[PDB]
Design a protein around this ligand. Structure first.
Ligand SMILES: OC[C@H]1C[C@@H](O)CN1c1ncnc2[nH]ccc12
Ligand SMILES: [Cl-]
Length: 167
């Protein structure tokens, strides 16, 4: 039993809700919140900009130190940093950004990072301003993640479309 509330069950391990991931994190304080990151951990907009804003820019400050020490992430890769006021940990995961010309086959690799954590509050990878097809991303999530994932989908129209089209 966990404290996630109001989620529609999709499969054995994947759940979905129409909510802002920031608000789900503020309410649940999950062990792991996933950020839809880029390789530079520049949290400018979308999920990343919203999460970072909710930390009063502390996520960005921590991220800049991480990059100064370690260099950029790989597309498809991840790192674990603090969850600040929102969660115990933040798993920064880089899905491909097709608006930047990055490669969509890397979406499965990106979701594989979730399997290192038993339970996660996560956004739909490569959705929104990353420019990928959200229906495809949900399919990759369900077919790749084996641990328990709670997907928070901010956009109501998208949530409705995702549920109604799920196979
Ligand atoms: O709607 C699903 C995706 C794609 C784009 O619409 C934004 N987005 C989010 N999902 C979950 N939490 C979020 N907080 C802020 C934005 C956001
Ligand atoms: Cl977005």
């Amino acid at each position: 039993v966990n404290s996630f509330s109001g989620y529609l069950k999709l499969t054995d391990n994947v759940y979905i809700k129409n909510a802002d991931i920031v608000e789900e994190a503020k309410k649940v304080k999950p062990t792991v919140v996933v950020n839809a990151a880029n390789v530079y951990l520049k949290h400018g907009g979308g999920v990343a900009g919203a999460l970072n804003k909710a930390t009063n820019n502390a996520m960005q400050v921590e991220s800049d130190d991480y990059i100064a020490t370690n260099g950029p992430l790989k597309v498809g890769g991840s790192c674990v940093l603090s969850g600040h006021n929102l969660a115990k940990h933040c798993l920064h995961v880089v899905g491909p950004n097709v608006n930047k010309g990055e490669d969509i086959q890397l979406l499965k690799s990106a979701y594989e990072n979730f399997n290192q954590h038993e339970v996660l509050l996560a956004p739909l990878l490569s959705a929104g301003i990353f420019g990928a097809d959200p229906i495809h991303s949900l399919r990759v999530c369900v077919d790749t993640v084996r641990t328990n994932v709670y997907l928070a989908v901010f956009d109501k129209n998208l949530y409705d479309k995702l549920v109604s089209s799920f196979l």
